[PDB]
């Protein structure tokens, strides 16, 4: 016995059905549509729609095999990969927070470049989708990062002196890697929601995409939005849609956040913005902050590893160690 409330039917048709004495989905399957339609005063089209929507409504070993057969996305940071278990995990939503100038955008560019590394070197060999909300995407920086990756991979392959490594690196050229990054631009949050809604079919046609980046999510939602409840509902819906998409399409998702100041008594602490309930949305959360002239990466929340602190650096080659 399945209640009608458990189905995504129209409120009007459900009101009519409960008026006519309908409370179970099982009894609906044994009645001709004409008789029920003339009894409840419902036209043929919506009756057929109700009939079809009613009709339409993986052991852990397989999960282990799937997790092991697909790798992580390397960040060119050995310690960060070690504390992440191998890099950014697929099927998981990741969040990055930090004060301006720490290097969130550099990390996003590095990930977009690295996601196309051939699997012979431990990569995923997939495309990337970059969504920009603040206009901080500079092509020259991406070119520099791609050239640095080219040089590093070429040196590693030459030192190892294999055979299939050279073949894999043959097609791994600047034009090929630059042609596999898809760029979108959103100004208002309505445009971001529209692009999110269009994402499923686009990923369906572009089945080789293995990365989705949304650089800047606090900016579209922190200005000219007085109603806090509406913002909370929109953010919850966006998080649910993003995790559903990431799991369905075998994707790694990275979101970028901004810090804010919380004042208690007479001392101030830097905390991530967008309220407290937003903390449950991200599967993995990282925080970048300054200490003297050193940059530190802290794993704040994660259901697989332990809290750690990592020293990283930004160089002309890009995101690196030390």
């Amino acid at each position: 016995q399945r209640d009608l409330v458990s189905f995504p039917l129209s409120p009007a048709v459900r009101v009519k059905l409960v008026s006519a004495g309908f409370q179970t989905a099982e009894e609906l399957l044994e009645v001709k549509p004409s008789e029920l339609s003339k009894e409840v005063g419902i036209s043929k089209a919506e009756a057929l729609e109700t009939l079809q929507i009613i009709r339409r409504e993986c052991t852990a070993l397989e999960l282990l095999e799937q997790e092991h057969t697909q790798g992580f996305i390397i960040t060119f940071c050995s310690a960060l990969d070690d504390i992440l278990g191998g890099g950014v995990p697929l099927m998981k939503t990741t969040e990055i927070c930090g004060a301006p100038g720490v290097g969130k955008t550099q990390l996003c560019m590095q990930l977009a470049v690295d996601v196309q590394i051939p699997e012979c070197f431990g990569g995923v060999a997939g495309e990337a989708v970059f969504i920009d909300t603040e206009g901080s995407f500079m092509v020259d920086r991406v070119v520099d990062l791609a050239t640095a990756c080219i040089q590093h991979l070429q040196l590693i392959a030459e030192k190892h002196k294999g055979e299939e490594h050279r073949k894999a690196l043959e097609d791994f050229t600047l034009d090929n890697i630059l042609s596999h990054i898809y760029y979108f631009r959103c100004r208002d949050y309505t445009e971001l929601l529209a692009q999110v809604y269009l994402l499923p079919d686009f990923l369906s046609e572009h089945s080789k995409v293995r990365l989705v980046i949304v650089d800047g999510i606090a900016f579209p939602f922190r200005h000219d939005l007085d109603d806090l409840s509406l913002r909370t509902r929109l953010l919850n819906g966006l998080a649910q849609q993003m995790i559903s998409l990431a799991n369905n399409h075998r994707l790694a998702v990275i979101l970028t956040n901004q810090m804010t100041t919380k004042i208690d008594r007479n001392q101030a602490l830097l905390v991530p913005a967008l309220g407290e309930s937003w903390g449950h949305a991200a599967t993995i959360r990282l925080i970048f902050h300054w200490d003297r002239k050193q940059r530190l990466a802290t794993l704040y929340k994660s259901p697989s590893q332990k809290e750690c602190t990592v020293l990283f650096q930004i160089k002309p080659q890009g995101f690196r160690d030390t």
Partner: protein
Amino acid sequence: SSLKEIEPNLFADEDSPVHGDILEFHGPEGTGKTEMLYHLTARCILPKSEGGLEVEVLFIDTDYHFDMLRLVTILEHRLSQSSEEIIKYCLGRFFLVYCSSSTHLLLTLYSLESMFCSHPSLCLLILDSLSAFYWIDRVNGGESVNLQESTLRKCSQCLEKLVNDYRLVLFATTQTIMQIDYRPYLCKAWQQLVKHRMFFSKQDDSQSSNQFSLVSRCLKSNSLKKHFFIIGESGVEFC
């Protein structure tokens, strides 16, 4: 069947052989309505020798929150001499019924009448969470007020008929959802059918974690009664 022996503490001066009485409980989560019902059942189910009454009781379970281990622990810790045979003999009288929907509730109400007329010994009835399906049938009926609450009104009519027919005493359990504060949201008829209100409140501090406050009013006198009581593993004890 006099109200003085049932509960002289809560009921100050209402003593008479009852032709029928309706009592309802209102309170937030974790206040002690179920524990009070357990205490009433324990005081109403034991043999006359151990302060019991030896009269029939029926329990309707709608919240699915009835715990039998707690009840048996309360009965064991209440009496003087404890044994398996006597506890089985005592629990051979308890009655429990399950429900799943308002229509199923009405069907069970109608079906119970066979055993109910076959047993003149039935004198006390317990209903819990008659507002459990309030949101479901409020949303099913849409904006039409008559469309909603209709089956609840029929159930109230049947319950009133039964209780005024065979001289029952009934205890009901409600829920606090909206907002001595009280905001009714049920049907008007059942609101009229009540006789006294048991507002349930709980104190935050751990020193009073076992002490709770009760307020009762009489519909024909509007008199306020206050009561403090202490919960325990053996049951419910008063001040």
